[PDB]
Symmetry: D3
Subunit: 166 residues, 6 copies
């Protein structure tokens, strides 16, 4: 039962916070595939996944970062709420990463975060710097981060991705 | 192949020992859902899960704690054996938590534990205190632990849950 | 070179965040003594230590919690800044726990926290609940938490402890 | 989509590197079963799994060790490449363990390893010693390791296992 | 203040439970030296250290294993109580390893263990097997474990070591 | 007893491999000070420390990276052997980082590495990229990595640092 509610959307976790291993769920066998081990001495600054039944810019489900103090197991599903979006350009084109938090029912730790600007400057910079450099060592690949936009913008991105899938 | 044998019953793990993240398996997609992150500075004193094809007091499969020195991955299934049951009352009514150990074929570490009284006083108190306080910070929720009962009592609870499902 | 500056005071770490092992530094050999392993399924919600050359209510150096996203090694020393104080009563009398953060030069993650009220409600409740229950299982011991006071109050506590030592 | 290419074969991970818990995937429910907790103070020297749609010496899919600096989650699937095979005899008969590495696209860390002899003497000895002793404490079970053979030999083992399944 | 009381003797921890890194304290600088990284895929089955101001069979302070569910930091000191001794022969001669537990004041988890026979068969076998094989891969070194003796025997070993130092 | 032998020099560890916390030993109290928590989502690619009784380019003891598969505890001392040196320029001037491995007596895992060129291209690139970016987020600070030089060059750096201290 995939929920597309901006304040309670399902996010399938593929990368656990702090891990340097990117997994990728196969949409036909449900197999969690080992996709990449970071080339650099880095670790994902947040849990990372995708929103089912959506179609993002690159033809794959729209991506979402789920910020939390804890790391969720790759393969699990967490109900989250949008607070913003991170825009970036890579060798394939534009890419968007929804910025979310688990719903308060799951973990109210950051219930005070209502919009992108409520997140600390330090956290935003860390996330931006990660995407800006995590593919440095990968040949023929690169990422140029543009910046973050608020929840209103993120909702537009989500709805556009939902409509595209339909 | 779900086994309901008291000395070798299947337990689907939803919470790994030492974790502060409670997962919950969805019975229709097999999706491991992130259900709750403990509000307090606590961690589950044992692996936690449910017995398939059973119907407990609250309408959900009967719960079981699988005591072990190691933490089993959420989503895995372990064959266990009963040694007792923990009775408690929450805001919804009575609740029972079967107390089990992996079968000796899997891990014989605590093969000497034949009944609830074989478990140390310290371990029992730690488990009781966990359930007695882990929901303190959650509004409108609470737990009043009654105490532990032996294997004979646990078997009755299991059989009643098995019959109810049938 | 022990600094007693409220915005840059030295804190000797004795307990690492997330650990259930309390160490205690011996002031004569510099030996890090294993003092206690929590009886319950809990873990320290922050790094914990004391301020050298001070004399608190119980005759020992004044205690300080150093809030951080990371865990500092027991035995290390971190320069911190005060943001508040936690008052509680135990079986021995009143006790105070200074609430601090590493100085921005060390980690600016929570540089936005200027006073106790800047900390999230969730974090404060978790800390309070920890002290309120972590000694439940210890016989003849108990803790009744009163509440938190601001940085202005914490500074008074520190200065009083510094003067007492002198 | 199971790939049987020697330089890109699918390996279903059942044991994560450094873990002392052996899981076993059930081929009918996809359930990850807890199979064994090592009796000794040991840990798997590599990620461990099997190659789907193959039939090894003991009637089960052929086993493969996936050497890596990182530990892959039990239940995930990694595309690997063969570099050798480890031959051993146990109480049931001969057994073979394919020796592999993730494909360079996933992690190029050990891209320099082209054949068994490229692996360090220390790593080979550690792996051999693990299988030679990890079942010492298990009654009625034992392992006598013969030695390692090169990639050419491993390919023969794989093809024979693939044909047997067909 | 080194205590030589059999029921409360000081043990300086040099190896943390589960670690594969053996440290060794230098008695002149207090420097914790990295001494050895296990050659095999193994990990210490208990915390390991020595009793200050004693002289064991090999001319060094008498060794002690401190059994616990938790791992103590290398370099820390824990007050323990004897429950037995493990006798073994290596390439240098006879060696004895005192078997201890933290005093109940520190952690009462295993307060029920009064003598060697109170420890589980599984734990004893795991410890014995560790010493029997952890030096297999080290050239010119080996260990032949004899067996465990009770607390009465351990006390004799300790007193003899204390007298020798004096 | 500080050894300055190129093939067995003492290295005081201040940063443990994989950690994002940089400690710094105080040369007057032996206090392990918390110096910095990385601003980015990164982790040290190796154990890091300094060689006692030496004087490097910046007036502090010469730095050394100790490559290993395991992480050594901050504050410990490991005997290492040189295999190269990493040259870089920061906002303060030129800086050199000796590249070393534990001596074979401690851990022979990488005994095959005799000179810088024996290290994998992947490991060298990861280390270089770490220093090139780990200070990106720190204001008024930066690092421009030049490249690695062999053991012969590293020895010159060490001897020059030893003479300078004398």
């Amino acid at each position: 039962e995939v929920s597309h509610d901006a304040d309670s959307l399902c996010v399938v976790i593929e990368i656990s916070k702090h891990s340097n291993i990117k997994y990728e769920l196969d949409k036909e066998s449900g197999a969690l595939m080992v996709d990449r081990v970071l080339y650099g001495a880095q670790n994902y600054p947040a849990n990372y996944g995708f929103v089912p039944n959506t179609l993002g810019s690159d033809g794959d489900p729209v991506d979402a970062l789920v910020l939390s103090d804890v790391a969720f197991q790759a393969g699990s599903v967490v109900k989250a709420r949008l607070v913003g979006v991170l825009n970036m350009e890579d060798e394939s084109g534009m890419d968007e990463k929804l910025i979310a938090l688990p719903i308060d029912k799951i973990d109210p730790t950051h219930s005070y975060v209502k919009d992108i600007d409520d997140l600390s400057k330090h956290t935003l910079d860390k996330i931006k710097h990660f995407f800006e450099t995590y593919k440095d060592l990968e040949p023929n690949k690169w990422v140029k981060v543009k910046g973050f936009e608020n929840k209103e913008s993120a909702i537009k991105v989500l709805e556009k991705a939902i409509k595209a899938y339909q």
